[PDB]
């Protein structure tokens, strides 16, 4: 996260870390057995790490559970990143408590102007690299569809929205991919892509989760 603040241990209880030997992407816990992340975070051998704050220290609230199957969206396009969303089923159900909790799926799409919380363990610098060990947080507004498309001409689909600041300085970044954008207690976005991080007129682009709610619900119901 560039230009954010330290969340505080376990203040974002639905945040997961996807680990294949090292942290490579974020994700959100949507019920005791399913995680939603970005389709571009797909790989085999994923271990889901719940209840994390410092991903390099075992502090006592962690649950490490292996994934039993991953399901990338049927229309994921890796060249355009349209439909960048994937579901991971855990091999065992997570034990839910105040520090490990699920986030609700939205009933409505959130409008431009809504302030949201974005979190993850991605890079914290706009040029150069420094990866945090503890979870970082950023409050950012959803931007209008016209600001988003004027920033990324020919690249924004209806399954995408922008959030952040056109002045730059604050944004998610590499490593935050797959992670949550929560607005009014509902998961509305998944960290997906952007041009660099925290650049002027280059806000983050996020997968619009409210378009995928029937696919999530039907897939969970049969798998
Ligand atoms: Ca830890």
UniProtKB/Swiss-Prot annotation:
Tissue expression per record: Synthesized in the acinar cells of the pancreas.
Give the protein's recorded name: Serine protease 1
Q: Which residues bind Ca(2+)?
A: 52, 54, 57, 62
Q: How does it assemble?
A: Interacts with SERPINA1.
**Reaction(s) catalyzed by this protein?**
Preferential cleavage: Arg-|-Xaa, Lys-|-Xaa
Protein family membership: Belongs to the peptidase S1 family.
Superkingdom classification of source: Eukaryota
- What is an annotated GO biological process for this record, any one? digestion
Known EC number: 3.4.21.4
Regulation of catalytic or functional activity: Is inhibited by scorpion cyclotide trypsin inhibitor TopI1.
Q: Where in the cell is it found?
A: Secreted, Extracellular space
Tell me how the cofactor is bound. Binds 1 Ca(2+) ion per subunit.
The record's PROSITE patterns line, in alphabetical order, gives: TRYPSIN_DOM, TRYPSIN_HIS, TRYPSIN_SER
Cite the post-translational modification comment: Subsequent cleavage after Lys-125 leads to alpha-trypsin. Further cleavage after Lys-170 yields pseudotrypsin. A cleavage may also occur after Arg-99.
Q: Where does substrate bind?
A: 171-172, 174-175, 177
């Amino acid at each position: 996260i560039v230009g954010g603040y330290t969340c505080g241990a376990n203040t974002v209880p639905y945040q997961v870390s996807l680990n294949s030997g090292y942290h490579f992407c974020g994700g959100s816990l949507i019920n005791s057995q399913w995680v939603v992340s970005a389709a571009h975070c797909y790989k085999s051998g994923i271990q889901v790490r719940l209840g994390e704050d410092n991903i390099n220290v075992v502090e006592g609230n962690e649950q490490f559970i292996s994934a039993s199957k991953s399901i990338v969206h049927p229309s994921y396009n890796s060249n355009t990143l349209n439909n960048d969303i994937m579901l991971i089923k855990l091999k065992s159900a997570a034990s839910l408590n105040s520090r490990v909790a699920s986030i609700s799926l939205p009933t409505s799409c959130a409008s431009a102007g809504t302030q949201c919380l974005i979190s993850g363990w991605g890079n914290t610098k706009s040029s150069g690299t420094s990866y945090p060990d503890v979870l970082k947080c950023l409050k950012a507004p959803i931007l209008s569809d016209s600001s988003c498309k004027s920033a990324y001409p020919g690249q924004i689909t209806s399954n995408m929205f922008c959030a952040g600041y056109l002045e730059g300085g604050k944004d998610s970044c590499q490593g935050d991919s797959g992670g949550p954008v929560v607005c009014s207690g509902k998961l509305q976005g998944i960290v997906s892509w952007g041009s660099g991080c925290a650049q002027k007129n280059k806000p983050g682009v996020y997968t619009k989760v409210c378009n995928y709610v029937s696919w999530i619900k039907q897939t969970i119901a049969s798998n």
